[PDB]
Design an enzyme around this catalytic site. Structure first.
Site, mmCIF file in Angstrom:
data_model
loop_
_atom_site.group_PDB
_atom_site.id
_atom_site.type_symbol
_atom_site.label_atom_id
_atom_site.label_comp_id
_atom_site.label_asym_id
_atom_site.label_seq_id
_atom_site.Cartn_x
_atom_site.Cartn_y
_atom_site.Cartn_z
ATOM 1 N N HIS B 43 -11.316 113.440 8.719
ATOM 2 C CA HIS B 43 -12.717 113.427 8.275
ATOM 3 C C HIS B 43 -13.400 114.778 8.260
ATOM 4 O O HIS B 43 -14.456 114.946 7.635
ATOM 5 C CB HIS B 43 -13.527 112.379 9.063
ATOM 6 C CG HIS B 43 -14.253 112.902 10.276
ATOM 7 N ND1 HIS B 43 -13.909 112.525 11.556
ATOM 8 C CD2 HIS B 43 -15.354 113.683 10.400
ATOM 9 C CE1 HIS B 43 -14.767 113.045 12.412
ATOM 10 N NE2 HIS B 43 -15.658 113.754 11.739
ATOM 11 N N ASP B 97 -7.435 109.073 11.701
ATOM 12 C CA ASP B 97 -8.223 110.281 11.463
ATOM 13 C C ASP B 97 -7.465 111.526 11.955
ATOM 14 O O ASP B 97 -7.777 112.085 13.016
ATOM 15 C CB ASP B 97 -9.547 110.169 12.206
ATOM 16 C CG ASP B 97 -10.542 111.183 11.760
ATOM 17 O OD1 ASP B 97 -10.197 112.007 10.888
ATOM 18 O OD2 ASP B 97 -11.679 111.158 12.281
ATOM 19 N N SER B 195 -15.645 116.838 16.208
ATOM 20 C CA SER B 195 -14.495 116.179 15.595
ATOM 21 C C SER B 195 -13.384 117.169 15.364
ATOM 22 O O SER B 195 -13.626 118.291 14.944
ATOM 23 C CB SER B 195 -14.873 115.561 14.241
ATOM 24 O OG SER B 195 -15.795 114.516 14.420
#
Lengths: 26, 246
Positions: B43, B97, B195
């Site tokens: 992502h 992810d 992230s």
């Protein structure tokens, strides 16, 4: 396999300020 | 990172910063797994709804950076190629992810730059257990601003049934959650910007750090009852091998 061994810690036989928390959890 | 602390110099030498080339902009964390292979969350590079669909030439990575310029310590690398998991479910729950970025030029290891290890089967079985704590690091949000020093927090791995119960999002075997329960006394969690950042664990079999997770998602940050989610690195290693061994 030169991985996961920090020069300023593992290599100098020094432990960081919080890694003992991880050992304690085990 | 919410409710964590500043990292000690050299504490996370595998820490990598993913930047948008122009305009210069920090996008996510990432981690060094060799002198030329970097791990991160898919992502961070591909998420259409936020207009993220980067090309290799769109970014750069920064390694060994202690602040938000160490002329002789940190490294700035261009990317050779990006690889996003083929079955990365960005439309629903962010399943799988994960992504790999190959640098144009391998980087020289140092006191401030060195690769984290990737888990093997017995290391994972043994370390991946509810209650055991791991470590999250990132340059992300301090609250739902950002730090000038890499932040760190250790958090306990939570039981699957409990993770599921904490959220309506559909969680998969390709994720795991870690964090303190409001009745536990301690706080902390990754947050926006974090992230791609590694969630690591130190192995007593050999005193080496292993990356067991990648910072993927959460609802809010350090919210009571909520628990941050991470990409289950080990269950996706074969894809990692496939890609790397091209």
């Amino acid at each position: 396999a030169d991985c996961g061994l920090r020069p300023l810690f593992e290599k100098k036989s020094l432990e960081d300020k919080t890694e003992r928390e991880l050992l304690e959890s085990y | 990172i919410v409710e964590g602390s500043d990292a000690e110099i050299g504490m996370s030498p595998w820490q990598v910063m993913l930047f948008r080339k122009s305009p210069q902009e920090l996008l996510c964390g990432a981690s060094l797994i060799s002198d030329r292979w970097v791990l991160t969350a898919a992502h961070c590079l591909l998420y259409p709804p936020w207009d993220k669909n980067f090309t290799e030439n769109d970014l750069l990575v920064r390694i060994g950076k202690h602040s938000r310029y160490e002329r002789n310590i940190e490294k700035i690398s261009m990317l050779e190629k990006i690889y996003i998991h083929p079955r990365y479910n960005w439309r629903e729950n962010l399943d799988r992810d994960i992504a790999l970025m190959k640098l144009k030029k391998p980087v020289a290891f140092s006191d401030y730059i060195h690769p984290v290890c990737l888990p093997d089967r017995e290391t994972a079985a043994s370390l991946l257990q509810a209650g055991y704590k791991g470590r999250v690091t990132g340059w992300g949000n301090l609250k739902e601003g950002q730090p000038s020093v890499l932040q760190v927090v250790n958090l306990p791995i939570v039981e699957r049934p409990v993770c599921k119960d904490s959220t309506r999002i559909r969680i998969t075997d390709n994720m795991f959650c870690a964090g303190y329960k409001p009745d536990e006394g301690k706080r902390g969690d990754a947050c926006e910007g974090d992230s791609g950042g590694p969630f690591v664990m130190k192995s007593p079999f050999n005193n080496r750090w292993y990356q067991m997770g990648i910072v993927s998602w959460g609802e809010g940050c350090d919210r009571d009852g909520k628990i941050g989610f991470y990409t289950h690195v080990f269950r996706l290693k074969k894809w990692i091998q496939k890609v790397i061994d091209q």
